[model samples]
Target: NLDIIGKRIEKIKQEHETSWHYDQDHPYKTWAYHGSYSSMVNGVVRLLTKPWDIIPMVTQMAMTKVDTRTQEPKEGTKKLMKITAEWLWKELGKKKTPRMCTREEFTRKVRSNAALGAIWKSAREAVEDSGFWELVDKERNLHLEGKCETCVYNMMAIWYMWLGARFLEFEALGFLNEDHWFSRENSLSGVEGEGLHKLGYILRDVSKKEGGAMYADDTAGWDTRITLEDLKNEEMVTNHMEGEHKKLAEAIFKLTYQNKVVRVQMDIISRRDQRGSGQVVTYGLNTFTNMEAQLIRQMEGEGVFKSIQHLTVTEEIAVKNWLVRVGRERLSRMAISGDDCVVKPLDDRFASALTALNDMGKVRKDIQQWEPSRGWNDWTQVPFCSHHFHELIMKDGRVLVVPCRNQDELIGRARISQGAGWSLRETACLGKSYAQMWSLMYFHRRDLRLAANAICSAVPSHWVPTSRATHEWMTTEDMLTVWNRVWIQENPWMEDKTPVESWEEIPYLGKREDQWCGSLIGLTSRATWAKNIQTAINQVRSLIGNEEYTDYMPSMKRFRR
Candidate 1:
C-alpha cells in the first residue's frame, strides 16, 4: 500500500510538478499513514481483528486539516462536521445500546428524526454563517451538496457514527473510566508526575471555548460530581443514582465535542484500514515508477535499471539469484519472466502522449502491429490509455516487473526485480518504457488484448512484434505499404475536412477564428489531483492531528492490525 500510494504521489509530481510539495514543510508529504492504537497490546490486537470497523473512524481524522485551518472552512468539512455532530447527538439520545445501523436505518431513524434533523439544520446554518460554504460555492461554482455530502459530510458521518458506536462498545465492555479525564482537573501548578493534570488543563481550556451547552453545568444535568472511590467501583459506577457515572458521561461528552476525539479516532482507524488494505496500491506504484522513470529518462536514457542494455552480467546474475531466493522464501512470490536478457526499458511519457493524441484525433498510426482475426486491434496498444494499464504500471513499478506469462510467472519477476544487482529504470520508462504505450493501448481499447500478447512476446518462446522499432527498422516502401493500411487509411485527419464557414459556428471550438483554423483557443487547464489529495489529507487530518498521525507510534500499531 505504501508503495502504491507513493507511486501515485510520484506521478502527480511528474505531470503537475507544482501541485504538491516535496519539502517537509510543504503541505503534502510523500506518504500519509494514520498511526496505531495507543492502548495496551491486547487492545491493539482486539482492534485489528475488526479492521473494517475502524475504517470510518480513521478516515475522518485523516481528513480534519481541511476544515479547522481555513479562514473560511471547506463546505465539505462543514457538512462533515455537521453530519457527524448530528449522528453523535442521535446516538447519545437513543434509548437502546449503540450498535451498527445500516445506511437506510441511519438516515431514516437518526437523520430524518425531528430532533436530529433540527440539529443538522442548525449545524448547516452555522456552517453557512461561517462563510466557508459560500466561499467554496462561489470560488469553484460548485454546489456544496454535490461536493460536500460525498467528500466531507458522508466521510465525517461514517467516522463520527462508528467512533460513537466504538465508545458505546467500550462503555458496555467496561473499558471506560467512570470519571473520565475531562471532568476533574489536577492542578497544573508545580505538579510533578501530572499527566492527568496536564490533560485536564488542556481539556478544561478547550471545553470553555468550544464545548458549548453540553459542557455547561446549569443547562445540562452533566455537572453532577463524584468521588474517585465511587468511580473505581463497578456497581457504583453504573448506578444511575450515584452521579459519578453522569460525571463520567459528561466528561466523555465534553471530550467528544471539544477535542473531537471521535473524529481523531475515526481518522486513525480509517487511515490504517486504507493503508493496510492498500486501496491505492496500483495507482501509487504506477505513478511512482512513471515519474521516476520520466526523471531518469529526461536526464539520461541509459542507466543500470533505466535500460536493459546497461545491465552487467553480475547484475543479471544477482537479479536471477534474488528471484530464486524469493521463490524459496515467500509463498506468494510467483516468478514471471525467467530470462534476464528480455528485460527492457519502461518509458511511457512520450508514448502515452502520442497514444492520447491518437485517441483525441491529433495523431494517426497503427501504433502496435495486430491481426484483425486476433481480436487485439484497438487503442489498447497505447500505454496509459486505460485503467488496467495504469494499474499495471503502478503494480509493476512497485512490485518489480518480471516476465510473467501468468500468475505462475509473478514469483520469478519479483526475484529478478529485487536482487542486489537490480538496477532501477534509467530512463523515463522503467522497463521497456515503450511497453507502457503498448500497455495503454491494450488496456484502453476494448478489442485489444495486446497487453497480454505483448507480455507473452517478451518471453523467450513467443516473439511478438512491437511498434517500438518500426519507425527505424522498416524500409520506405515497406513503411508505405504498412502505413497505407494501418496509418494513412486509419488517420481521421487525412480524410476529414469542412468548410471554414461551416466550422465557425461550433461553440465547443471556442471562437470563430479557432473553429475555422481547427484549433483550440484561450484554453486554461488545471489538474485537480493535488487539490483533491490535499483536501483528502486535510479532511483526514482533522480526524487525526495531521497526516503524520497516520504513521505515528500510537496510530501505526492500530492500523497494522
Candidate 2:
C-alpha cells in the first residue's frame, strides 16, 4: 500500500505543481501549488465584479478636499481631509490599482493604503450612517434580483467594509486586541501586559456602562464575578479565549441575528463571560479550530462535550448532506460531454474554469496512504497556515492531499469549477454552488461516520444493534429537524425574535434555488475563502502563527490478532 501510494504521488507531480510527494529520495522543489487555478478564478471574478479601485479611489477622494456629495462636514471638514490625505500620502507613497485582482490580491494591493483603512475606523463618524446602510441595502436588493452576478461581488466588498467597521469598533473599544503584556517581555504596565489582566479590566469597565453587553433575553443571567486572579492559572493562548475569538463571537452573533448563519461553521452555544463585560450569558462558544476544541475537551475533561450540548458533528453532517443532495439537483441540469463523465461548458472563461477544477481533482486523487491513518493523525484533514505533506484516506478511497492552501479554498475552487462545468450557458447569471457543496460534503462526511463508529465501539454490551445502527443514520429531513430545533432555541442570531419559524426564515436553507444562490453569494463575496469570521480567523491566524506539522509518511506494521 505504501509503495503503491508513493508511486501515484510521483505520477501526480509530473503532471501538476505539487507541494509534496511520497519519495523522501526525490529532491524537493518550491512550494508552488494551485497558483494557476487561483489566477483563473480571480480572472473570472474580476470580469464579473469589476471591483472598485479601492486604493486610488479612496486616496483621491480623501485628498480632493471637496465635499462632492453635496453635503459638507458640519465642522472643519477640510482639515480632516487634509490631515487624512497627508497621512495617507506619507504612508502609501503612491496610488495604483492592480489592473486585475482576486479578493486576496485586492487586499494585498490596498494593505498599505491608509486612506482605505481609515474608512473602516469609526466609519459612522467618518461617513453618514444613512448613506452607508442605504448603499448596502441597494446592493442586497440587486443580489435579490439575480439579474447580474456582479451584485454579489459589489455586495461582498461592502460586506468586507461593514465587517471591518465593526471589527475596528471592537478593537478600539478594547473588546478585542493584542495585549502588550502577553508578550512576557513587554515593558507596558502590569495590567496592560498580561492578557487576562487586560481582559478583566475591559470587562469591569464595560460591566458598569449603561449599554454594555445588553441582551434581548431578560430572563437570561449575565452576572459573573470571575476575576483576573481566578483566571491566572488557566491556559491563555491554548484557550484562545480572547482577541480574535471574541471578535468571532461578536460577528457570529451579529450575522446570526440577521437570519444568516455561516454554512460551514462548527460552533456550539455555551454561556461564558461576554469577554467584554464578564457577564455570563448564553453566548456562542468558538474554539476556532477542531484542534483547539480537542485541546479544550482534554483540558476541561470530556464533559466539555456535554456542556456544549448538541455539539456540532450533527450540524456539520446535516449541512453537508443537504449540500450533497442539492448539488446533485444542480448538476442534473447540465449534460455530460459525450459520456466522458466530464461536463461541457459554452463560454471560454467557464471552460477554462471547468478544466482548472478537473485538474485539481486529477492531482488530488493520486496521493498515497497507509493503514491506521486516523483523521486526527492526518495534517490534510484541516486547513492550517503552512504547507506540509501527509497521506490521509477517506472511505471512498479519496485522498485529502489536494495542494490547495486550505479546505475553503479547495471547496471554493471546486465550486467555481463545477459551477462553470455544468452551467453551459454563457450568460451573466452566476453559477450554482453544487460543485463546492459536494467538496464540502466529502470533506466532512467522515466526521459523521466516525462519530457513529465510535459510539458503536463504546457500547460493547449492545454491540450487535449498535454496529447495525451505524449502518443506518438520520435522514436529511431528520437532520434538518434537529438543526432547526437547536438553532431556533440556542442560536444567538435569532435575537429576541419568536421561535417556531420555518426553514424559509433561515438564511441559505430553503428552496434548492435559494440555498444555491444565497450560499454562492456568500462564498464568492467574502474576503477569505470561508463565509464566516471564525474560519477566516482560523486561516489568517494559522498563517500568522506559522505553525506546521510533520508529514506522515506511510510505514508498514503487520500484526497477528
Candidate 3:
C-alpha cells in the first residue's frame, strides 16, 4: 500500500509536469494568462467593490481558516457547513434572540446534531478513504510552503481547488453557465451547450478517478482495486468507424474532377475551323519616275502628306479608292451592253465581277481570322482604332479600342515625344512607333512559337504576353540594360514621362501613340510590371476584335483617279 501510494504520488507529479498548465512558453500562453488573470481579477474586484458582499467574503474566509487548521474537508463537508450556518442564522431571527452563541458553542451544537454528524462523518470518510490528505501534503511540499503557513495556504488552496472541481463537474454534466465568472455577459447557443454536455461526461470520469473510485460502476467502492486497462476498451468500435469515415472522405475528394466540363468545352472549340484576313494600303501617287522627285515636287506642295516618308491617309479613303478603280476597269469590261445593239464582253464582265468578289472575300477572311466575332460591322470600323478615339464618345468609349500591349508602350512614347517638343498627337504617334520597334526587336523574347501553340490549345486569339519567352527576356539584366538605353536614347520622351500616377492611370491613345508606344514598353521593362501588363491585356482582349489587321492598293499603272 505504501509503495502504491508513493507510485501514485510520482504519477501525479508526472501528470502535473506534462499538463497544459506547465507549458507557460506556448504560443497561446499570453492569451491563456490574460484570460485567467482577468477572471481572477474580476472576482476579486467584485468582492472588494461591493460593501454588501463583504460579510459573505469574511464568512468564507473564516470557514477556510477552520478547514485549513484540521484536515482539509471534502467538497461535501463544505456544503454541510454552509447549510448549518444558514439554519442557525434563520433560527436566531425567528426566535428574535438578542445575540447568537459564541463560535465554540456554535461549532459544538453543529457537531452534536445527528444529521450534521452523519454528513460530517460521510465527508471525512470520502476524503480519508481517497487518501486526499497525501495530495494536500505533497502539493504543499512541492510549492515549498513552510509548515507554519500550511494552515492558511491550505485554506486558500482548497477553496480554489473546490471551485475548479465544481467547474469541471458542471462542464462534464453539460450544465454550462452562459455568463461564467470571467466571461460574463456571454451566452452559449444550443450547439455550444451540447458540446459542453459531451465534455462534461469526460469530466465526470476524471472526477471519479480523483475521488479514488476503483471503477466508474455505481456498485464499486474505493476499496475495490482496478487497472488502467479497464477504461481503455470503452467505445473501441465507435473510434474505428470514425477513422474509416475520415479516410473515405479524403479518398473521394482526391478522385473527384471539378473542371471536367471546362476542359471539354475548350477541347471542342480548339478543334473547330477558324480563319482570318488582313491588308496593306498606300496612297498619294506621282507621275515622276524617281521616288525622291515625286516626294520633293508633288508631296511637298500639297501639305497633305506629313513627310516624304510618312504617307498620311485615313483607312476610309484607301478603301474607297480601291473600290472605284476595281469597278471601272474590271466591271465595265465585264458588263454585257445591250439596248439597241450595243455589245460588251460578257466573259470579261463576269471575270471582273468575280475578281472584285474575290478581293472582298480575301478581306472578309482576314477579318474573320484576325477578329472571330461576327457581331460588329467590320466595314465601318476604322483601320487603326486609336486608343483615345473613344474619348470623342459621351462615355469615353475610346478606352475600348486600346490594345493591351500598346498601353505601357504609349506611356514611354508620350514621355519621349513630350521631351522632344512634339505635339501630343505626334508624340503619341512616335510613342506608338517606338513600342512597335521595341516589340519587333524583342520578337524572339515574345515566344511566337508558344503563342501559336496556345492558340492551338484553345487559348483565345490575342497578342501573347508574359509567355515563357517574356520571362526569360525580362530576367536577362544585360538585355534590359541594352533595351532601356536604346529606348531612352531613341525616344527621349520616355525619360521625361512620369511613372504612371498609379497602376490604373495608363491611357489608351490608339494607333496615334499612347496606346501603341507609352504603356506597353513601360510596363514590360521589369518582370513584375510585365506580368501585370500581360494579365490586364489578356482580360481586355477577350472582350472584343480579332488578333490581326490587313488592307489593299491599286497598281502604279491604274493611278487614273
Candidate 4:
C-alpha cells in the first residue's frame, strides 16, 4: 500500500511540477502514511474547525455548481447539505431547513433558517440601503432566470438552491475576510514596553506569582466576575480579550481559527479568550504550531495514538530522520520564503506575483509595528503601497487587487495579480492559496499532500468550537465560483452596470482582457494532458480530504458558458 501510494505521488509530482522520487530510499513514507490515515485525521479535524468552516467546505462543493450545457445539477454538495440539514434538526434540536421548492426557499432555507431570515433579509437591505446591492444582479438571475452562470454569487444562489435564486444570507456568500482583527487596537497600551505580547496580540502583566487579575467583561458569569477565575479566566466577558492567550490556550484557539492542518478548535475554544478586553492567551505565535505538536504528543501519551510494535534501531533511525528532516525543512522554508519577502527588494521584485504574496504579507507585518510614530512613508514599502501593483490594503490589512490583471507582464498570472489599482478578483484568492501550497512543497521540500492540507483540512470543524457545525462564510471555492461566474467564456461582457458602458464586456481569458489565463489548471477537460491534471487533483482530494467530486465535464462546458 505504501509503495503504491509513493509511486502515485511521485507520478503526480512529475506531472504537477518539476520532479519527484525524492530518494529511492525516502519511500515518501510521510506522505503515504498521512494519506492512509487521512480518514481518521479528518475525523480529528472536525474536532478542531470553527463551525463556519465545517459546512462551507461541503456546501461549496462543485455539485453546487451548474453544468453549463444541460442546466442539470452536479453532485456532492447536496449529499453534504442533506446530511448537514439532517444534522441540524436531529442533533442541534433545530427546525428543519424547508425542502427546496422556490426562490423564497432559497432565501429562508439554503444558507439560513427561518429563525435567521429577518436578520438575513435586513442584512442585505442595510447594505442595499446604500447602493452595494446593485452590483448583485439578483432579480434577473432569480425571476428572469438569465444566465445564472453570469456571476459567482448566482452559482451558489441558484445551483445550490434547487431553482435559481438570489440570496440574502451574507455569511454563505461573503468574501475571504482574512485579517479577522480589523478596527481593533494594535496595542492595548501606549507604554513602550508593555506587560507582554505575542504575534500581534498584547496583554497586561498577569503572573501566577503576583497573582491577581480583574475581569474586564461578562460580569454575569462567575468567570466574568471581577473576581479571578472567571470565564475571563478562560477569557471573554465580551470585551476582556486581546491578542493574547495562555501559550497553551494561544496554540489551542489560534489553530482552531487559522489552522488548515488540524482544523479542530473545541479544545482551544473551551480554554481560549476573545479579543481586546484583555483576557486572552498571550503566548507567542510560534506556540500555535507548538500546541498542535503538543496535542500529537498528548495523543501518544494518553494512548490517542495507535499502538505500535517495538522498533529496531534501523527502523527507529529512519523515523527519527524523517521527523527531523521534515521539521527543519518546514521551519527553514517558511523562514526563507518569509524573509525573501521582506528586505530583498531586487529578489522580491523578481519574484512571481504569487510568491509576491510573501512580500505583500511582509508589508503587513511591517505596518503592525505600530510604534505610533509610524508615518505614511513607512507604510509605502508595503505591496498595497506599491504603485506598480495598484493594490489597496483593507482596514484589516488584506490586499485587494483590482479586477484587472497586469497585462503588461508576460509571466504566470495563474494566481498572480498585477495590481496597480487591483481589488481582489473572485478567483484571485487561488493565487496565494496555490502559492502557499506550491511554495511549501517546492521550497520546503515537503510532500505536496502535506503542503495542501496546511491550508484547508479534510474534516469538518468540531461542533463545539463551530457551535452548530458550520465553516467560514466564504471559502477558496466560493472565490473560484465567483471568478468563473464572470469569467464565462460565452458571455464575457453582458455587464453594463458599469457606469462606463465600454467596460461592460466581462474580461476574456488569454486575451488583452484577462491575460495569462492559459496558466490556470483545467478543472474540466478530457483532451490533451489536461485531463491527467484533473485526475491528479481528484486523487489528492481523495487522499487528503477524502471527499470526491465526480468529473462531469462535457465538451464546451468547461467552467461556465
Predicted candidate 4 versus true structure: per-residue lDDT over 1-561, tens digit per residue: 222223323333445453322333322311111211100112222211112122333223212101111111112212212222232123111221211123333344434422221212444343334343443335232322211221111111111211211232222111101111110121111111211111111111111112112111100121111111111112121122232212222322222211101101000001112111111121211112122222122222222222222334453444344433432222111111101111111112122221111111111223232221121122122221111112233333332222222322211212132224332221222323442323211211112212223223322221111111012223434322333332222122223222212211222222222213212223222123232334343443454343423332221123223
Better of 1 and 2 by TM-score: 2
Worst 10-residue lDDT window for candidate 1 reads 334-343
How do these models rank on TM-score, best leading?
A: 4, 2, 1, 3
- lDDT per residue for candidate 3 within 87-126, as digits (tens), equals 3223222323122123233234334421221112333343
Clashes of 1: 93
lDDT of 1 by residue, 22-105 (tens): 333323232142221111111111111122223343223223222211122233222222222233223222332322223233
Residues 314-356, candidate 2: write the lDDT tens digits: 5334333433343223222121111111111111122112111
Residue pairs in collision within model 2: 181-193, 256-493, 257-493
Clashes of each: 93, 3, 49, 57
TM-score of each: 0.16, 0.19, 0.13, 0.19
Query: What are the RMSDs of all candidates, in order?
Result: 33.7, 31.6, 44.6, 27.0
lDDT of each: 0.22, 0.23, 0.22, 0.22
The positional error of residue 154 in candidate 2, measured at the CA in angstroms, is 14
What TM-score does candidate 1 reach? Answer: 0.16
